[PDB]
């Protein structure tokens, strides 16, 4: 039913959100393991040695494999084209430093593949270098993704940066009437409790309900777009005592999969928190953790596809997405404690964004 590489980059990004979420245990997130799995798709090209080792290790393919390069290319093309209706704006980087020579026949490969292009910038000049790399995530993200490298992520001595940033308001396919929305109580980890803007709508909504190992119930919603190929998916234990870590620990891209081959639509009352979600993920300890760790040392670190003549570690490795929930006697939903939600491209059954609401 998936892709079989939208599939392994989903459960790859997933794997890579689980990391940052338990980091951040009680922070807001928002991620894209989609974009993650696809920048470090791109990066198993630059690589070699065992610094490609561990990456591949991690993502269970090779960019060197057969079809695979395609593939993803295929999927993206899929993922960012018109008829999807709902845009999404994206975009990734590697930018290395100027006048380091790179290896003869690298970048149109690399363009040939991706089709993308490795920027070349001169961090020498560190706040002018930094302008321009925002700039560029800005420019590419409908002025919506700034200053994701903030003072000191880069010095003179940065060779090496890895960029990726999205932005995502969607529009749904039944919204939620203006009127409805209002300030209500919302339920934090702690204890304590916050008055936000939550909407509210009766509708026949695509709704399930499965339980944790441990046996705890928790509620899943999808909200399709309105471009009737992206969906969220809301998910939250029912009981509050339980910590919605409990959600977490157990994701995967296949149960999501899962969650929406069960969803039976049904009249429902839900009460959802409009929310504004910024996050800026550094990517180095998570995907450390995951056994990626050669790729941050300066002299372990192999990038011999990309340069064989000079030395090169990532510097930044950092995704920045910004998504917005908005307008856009029956059983009563009200998501006024802790939740996950996960958009996903349901064509391809690509994971693009996974985050969890822990105060909205
Ligand atoms: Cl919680
Ligand atoms: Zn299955």
Not at 63 to 92: C, F, Q, V
Not at 143 to 164: F, P, Y
Not at 171 to 200: C, E, I, N, W, Y
Not at 331 to 346: G, K, Q
């Amino acid at each position: 039913p998936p892709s079989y590489v939208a599939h392994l980059a989903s459960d790859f990004g997933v794997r890579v959100f689980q990391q940052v979420a338990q980091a951040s245990k009680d922070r807001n997130v928002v991620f894209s393991p989609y974009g993650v799995a696809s920048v470090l798709a791109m990066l198993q090209l630059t690589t070699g040695g065992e610094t490609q080792q561990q990456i591949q290790a991690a993502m269970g393919f090779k960019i060197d494999d057969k079809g695979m390069a395609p593939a993803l290319r295929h999927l993206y093309k899929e993922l960012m084209g018109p008829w999807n209706k709902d845009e999404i704006s994206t975009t990734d980087a590697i930018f290395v430093q100027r006048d380091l020579k790179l290896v003869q026949g690298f970048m149109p490969h690399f363009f040939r593949l991706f089709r993308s292009t490795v920027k070349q910038v001169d961090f020498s000049e560190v706040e002018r270098a930094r302008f321009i790399i925002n700039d560029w995530v800005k420019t590419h993200t409908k002025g919506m993704i700034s200053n994701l490298l903030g003072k000191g992520a880069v010095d003179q001595l940065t060779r090496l940066v890895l960029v990726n940033a999205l932005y995502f308001n969607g529009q749904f396919k039944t919204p939620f009437p203006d009127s409805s929305t209002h300030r209500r109580l919302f339920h934090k980890s702690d204890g304590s409790t916050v008055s936000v803007p939550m909407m509210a709508q009766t509708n026949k909504f695509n709704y399930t309900e499965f339980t944790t190992p441990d046996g705890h119930y928790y509620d899943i919603l999808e909200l399709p777009y309105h471009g009737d190929t992206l969906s969220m998916f809301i998910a939250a234990p029912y009981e509050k005592e339980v910590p919605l870590s409990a959600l977490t620990n157990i994701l995967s891209a296949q149960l999501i999969s899962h969650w929406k081959g069960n969803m039976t639509r049904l009249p429902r009352l839900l009460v959802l928190p409009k929310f504004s979600l910024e996050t800026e993920v550094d990517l180095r300890k998570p995907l450390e953790n995951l056994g990626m760790t050669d790729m941050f040392r300066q002299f372990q670190a192999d990038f011999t596809s990309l340069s064989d003549q000079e030395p090169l570690h990532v510097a930044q490795a950092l995704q920045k997405v910004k998504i917005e929930v908005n307008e856009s006697a029956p059983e009563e939903i009200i998501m006024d404690r802790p939740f996950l939600f996960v958009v996903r491209h349901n064509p391809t059954g690509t994971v693009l964004f996974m985050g969890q609401v822990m105060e909205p």
